[PDB]
Design a protein around this nucleic acid. Structure first.
Ligand SMILES: [Zn+2]
Ligand SMILES: [Zn+2]
Lengths: 78, 81
DNA sequence: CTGGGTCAAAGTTCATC
DNA sequence: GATGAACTTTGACCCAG
């Protein structure tokens, strides 16, 4: 591989919903959109996302997905 | 490989295994024990045979067996909110 | 290449000592 | 405070097209 995840910095093989992303962030974004998940996420504090801490705050992760350009409309409701 | 509805045994204590945890076929007991040990960096005075009935009698030996059977500290992840 | 699905193995909770 | 049965989410890998 040569691409990296725009969300968390993990290895990325391709683009998912408009953005270079890892299998993790692809799966996470899919589930969030499909289930209409809203995250309260205790203390968001610094919404820093990296491979080791991506699962710490779901709110911070989702917000980063949108900030980097992931498209809700690109998630097929199958 | 491992499958959730298939009968397996714990490599540490011989109890019924709920699949592989941290690289080794283990029970929910040895999984939770290893997880807590690594997450808290727990120190065990204890320093013994590890089996279903006597696995809680010596925590030092339970932990040393987890490592000896191939449980990986790096497989334990960071806590989630 | 992109999408989606699967399900093992990561996660957490808490009743009961 | 520890344990571990039961519950929830993640993501590596497969594959349709
Ligand atoms: Zn990612
Ligand atoms: Zn065990």
């Amino acid at each position: 591989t040569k691409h990296i995840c725009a969300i968390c910095g993990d290895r990325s093989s391709g683009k998912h919903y408009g953005v270079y992303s890892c299998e993790g962030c692809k799966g996470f974004f899919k589930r969030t959109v499909r289930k209409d998940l809203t995250y309260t996420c205790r203390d968001n504090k610094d919404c820093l996302i990296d491979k080791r801490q991506r699962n710490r705050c779901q709110y911070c992760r989702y917000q980063k997905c949108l900030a980097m350009g992931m498209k809700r409309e690109a998630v097929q409701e199958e």
